[PDB]
Symmetry: D2
Subunit: 356 residues, 4 copies
């Protein structure tokens, strides 16, 4: 069992990092190009990022749903800046229009400055308290229940969603986060726990922690990983692309990016930035795991680099740990979606082996 | 100058009111039908209702935008249940994908039970205080300002919308409401003031009140009206159709709907229900102005009934009062969009006279 | 088993016959409206007419194929004005793009003036000879065979269609015609035999004739009927709609239509135009011939309440008719009217769609 | 003045020539991908090839017209296998549906076996006699005339097309062919004469000949060229890409392809295969003009290879001869459409300089 996702670059796209050379602006036409490419190639879905640097996820996902047949959309909900009852009605409507193709990514918000710009002034513990109260209302409302809820942060009275979703009991909940509060929330309410591309040993420890917490609640959760990928026909070509991707990066931009990550209140971001510490040398932190992406890009900071045999082998290693969802990306997002499907799909389990 | 809108029945559609006989469920295909009908017939735009009884406005409008060329979407924002910065980003993204076809309807929420289900426990004056603070943030954020705002209800710090909208300074704000708080808010911040289909004398008084208040703020506002329409080739056919529309309505339905409106906290809803009082006699409150819709339906509760000459004549009276936007609807919404465009457009000003 | 089709008005649409009042021109947007209506309402497919007065069937059908999900397209081929190998490749591409939603209507051409305008100067017997030779090449080419064929009219040598169709052995062949040559052709090569809306006794005789010939060829053919439909909630409303449909028709237009039909070398058109002789328009219970007063081709309509309309359909079904191709004025609104009033009274899956 | 076209691979696509390795099947989805890329990237149009090895041109263009906004479609008509009146009606319908985006490529048919497979048994002179009679009927029918014509090959009597086209007097006629009959037909009836990518000196001679013949008819024709393009950021990358494109070609495929080109009765095809003769050495017949494509591919068999500066300079040479249309292609067609648009458009005249 394996779900392979792609990524919609709603914050921008291009050939290189840290420079405007060869940059592609986010347009409806280009988003349509990437989404329809992923649809026809047979990817399970696409992850749509959310944040101040992105166009709105819900507008994009809804606009592309009628233009695609099978592709699923992993769209982010952001508790604390929208009413849970309103959020559930949006989730139901999009799930209904898409005929059950909506997936939910629970995003807590790691940048306090970004959160204060949205009107939320909560501490790290308070953000997860809101998310816990949010998910309880959202899950119960989508199951047809008239919800009365009075917690520390959220209060609703007779909350209903009159239009039930297609997927039961509700669209699957995906969630990522590395703090103790995050792991407790994942073990109790979510369906899939997502992690960024740490080395296999570190990933295994995070998964074991979630399993133990989930077992105490009598639940099991599935696991997914988010990874950039630079795959070519030969390993030499792949590594040249990795060097070419970050050649135009200045040392000033590396210093500014690391200082901005230090201001983030996110344990996942602190772990991702601690793999390189803004150092251009020794970026291969593990076999075929290259951390050059994290020099500038925020969030996902590691990439699998190599020929198809090497990339599939690293995928198999993550798969052997219990991971069933893989969310890949590449620069630029259109071309690399074709490249990954044509070079790696035949080496993956069904149905990806037969798609190519 | 005149803009003629149609209506997207996101809360359901059918041939009759108050019954499930001959009802059309809200599907993507059917909404596509109505929106594409309105686009090709030459309607200026469509109004999309919002509320607990509707599918989500933002998901619907975004899904239909790539499937239409010229048609504009009058979409509702609801201050108090969503962050103003997030709402601004959504408007910008939809305005960008549509290439400047987005119009905003500011909705305060007249049903206290619906609002408490959304997590809002505000009084009537507090709801208008929130909307005042919400609109101030939203308007400035869409103009490129990094906004700091600390009011009674909303507080943002470094609120930014990085993607500017297509329409300047922002997508136009349409607003409806009959209370004194509503008239102050409309005179200060909105672009078009909307009213439901009251008789011309009452409409003139509401328009005169708004003009006077807007002058104190050094502004002028445009005016629009919302009406159902039952137009046939002869007056007898129109009046026969109007009778058939409410033949299945029972007294229990009338009592249940009217008592439900008593719980509503809306001045505009209270004015609309005071026209008919839940009684089936004397439903023609003015020449060719029939209030039979408001027996069950909430919100717009009056319709123009007559032959094309009479309907066009009633439209001119409203235009002579200063009304420039007309938002029409009919049952069922697909067929009646064709009927109005084929029977009434040739009798209206340009460009509607030349479309046929 | 029953297939209910609708109709794409590619030659024009409106509310009334014989007048330009309330007419809807053929645009991409309006064609999109009718096709998407038919798709979402659950119609099996749409028949797309062909002729000098229509937009080209292949262009329209291709343009609507990516905008529809389940709807089938009954598209016409015209032997004698296009190479059979070229026609076969077009059928294959459209069938592949549509994922097997293409249906083929074989049209021989009943208007000699229109045929001479396209460059074909064949007699009535010559038209069916060309069609017979056309279909033999077309059917074999789509089955992957490199075809060598040298007939009286058509000659191909190493004719191949490299892209195989989705439907096997080829997209189904629908054909209509009342002559003895047409019946021989239908019994030998076609899959569905279509007739216009004659009264049941006349329809039954034509079906019996095709059945006997098909048994001699060791085949069975399915049967379909083409019918206009005017259905309202009560019979009085339906008949009022029928009267309103033809109120703008004078006798100058009637004489122009009948004189035009006197030049058609078509057996199915003369049988259709002999039911009214240019009053007493109800030639059978709930079968009204007012449509054929101007419109060439389909000339009868079922008029009545849903119970009456379904009953007339049930009578046709009991004779062996499995395909029904309906239409109404205007074609968008009436597609909804038929689906909401008659589908619940029809067999599966139409009973469950509404 | 310059119009830059791309190409729809309706006969198949892939990463390499002469092998099925890394091949992309022609699907509706993939054609939608290529066409929409060219539309959003700003190409004037796409050329759609015709022939036994392709999916039908008219079905494809009709399928993509509603899915694109500005892109033009250069579609081929083959006289001798379809009635001119029927063909004119198809052009009118597609021109009307596309709102005047249809361009016509007149194709005579160079393969006698393909022509005999379609039922045409004509010699080279007879094919041009048929085409001459075909175009006269087609052009006049589209101008509203009821045409009576009795020629050597074609006879129509009261031929009419009731639906007039959008472009007047008819959609522009593009034509390619190098024989004396082709040059007479182009100078007499067509709007744009197209040639394949021969060296600049040979192209200049052909253009001067077509100019002289057209002047005797008191006409001027525009000129276009069809070329493959392999452009990368550096010249070394381009030539390695050119070498890799034909590395998997075996000599049993070159011999089987050259023997089939001999059977062709096509002057232009004969000149194209005379540039290389099937040899793998000295394929650069002119500065940055590489003939490696014509080793297998029938028809267009020369490519521009180099860095953006070199490719732009070769384009300028052809333009200096009077060429205003450039029809480009690349492997694979989706990726290379972006590559050409991002590397060469800024070096071209307006509007291509401002698109990037
Ligand atoms: C796969 C994945 C996807 C994420 N997507 C987003 C996103 O779109 N926007 C965002 O702000 N944070 C995103 N995050 C980060 C977390 O959702 C959250 O914002 C925060 O960083 C978690 O804090 P914590 O790790 O200290 O518990 C994502 C994390 C993961 C693992
Ligand atoms: C044209 C128009 C459209 C409206 N649309 C909505 C709507 O979609 N949802 C809603 O809850 N209220 C709608 N309203 C009503 C107001 O937005 C609001 O809910 C309330 O009635 C205003 O309160 P007030 O009348 O006491 O000033 C609309 C009003 C008008 C005139
Ligand atoms: C259901 C049906 C559909 C037809 N559709 C067309 C059409 O679209 N265009 C057309 O020219 N003829 C059409 N025809 C007519 C026949 O295909 C053909 O032109 C002629 O009338 C048959 O010749 P015959 O009756 O003399 O044997 C149709 C006939 C039937 C019964
Ligand atoms: C730019 C261009 C495009 C062409 N496209 C086609 C095509 O789509 N199909 C085809 O069969 N021939 C095509 N040809 C070739 C001619 O249309 C014709 O078939 C033949 O090869 C020319 O004959 P001639 O050179 O002896 O005069 C094309 C030629 C050119 C220059």
């Amino acid at each position: 069992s394996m779900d392979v996702f792609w990524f919609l670059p709603t914050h921008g796209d291009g050939h290189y990092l840290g420079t405007t050379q060869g940059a592609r602006p986010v347009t409806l036409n280009y988003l349509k190009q990437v989404a329809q490419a992923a649809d026809s190639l047979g990817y399970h879905g696409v992850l749509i990022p959310t944040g101040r640097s992105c166009e709105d996820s819900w507008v994009i996902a809804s606009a592309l749903v009628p233009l695609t047949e099978r592709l699923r959309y992993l769209v982010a909900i952001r508790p604390g800046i929208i009413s849970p009852t309103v959020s559930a009605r949006m989730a139901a409507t999009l799930d209904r229009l898409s005929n059950g193709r909506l997936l939910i990514n629970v995003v807590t918000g790691g940048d306090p400055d970004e959160n204060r710009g949205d009107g939320s002034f909560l501490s790290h513990s308070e953000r997860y308290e809101v998310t816990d109260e949010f998910l309880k209302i959202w899950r119960r409302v989508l199951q047809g229940e008239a919800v009365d809820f009075e917690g520390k942060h959220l209060k609703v009275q007779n909350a209903k969603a009159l239009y039930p979703p297609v997927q039961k009991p509700y669209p699957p909940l995906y969630f990522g986060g590395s703090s103790d509060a995050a792991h407790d929330l994942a073990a109790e309410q979510v369906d899939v726990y997502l992690t960024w591309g740490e080395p296999p040993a570190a990933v295994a420890e995070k998964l074991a922690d979630v399993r133990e917490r989930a077992a105490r609640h009598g639940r099991k959760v599935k696991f997914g990983i988010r990874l950039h990928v630079i795959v070519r026909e030969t390993a030499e070509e792949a590594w040249k692309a990795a060097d070419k991707l970050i050649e135009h990066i200045s040392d000033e931009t590396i210093e500014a990016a690391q200082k901005s990550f230090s201001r983030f209140d996110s344990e996942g971001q602190r772990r991702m930035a601690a793999l390189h510490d803004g150092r251009r040398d020794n970026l291969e932190i593990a076999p075929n795991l290259w951390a050059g992406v994290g020099l500038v890009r925020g969030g996902s900071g590691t990439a699998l680099v190599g020929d198809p045999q090497q990339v599939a082998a690293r995928i198999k290693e993550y798969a052997d740990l219990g991971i069933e969802s893989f969310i890949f990306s590449g620069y630029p997002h259109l071309e690399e979606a074709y490249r990954f499907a044509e070079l790696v799909f035949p080496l993956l389990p069904e149905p990806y082996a037969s798609l190519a």
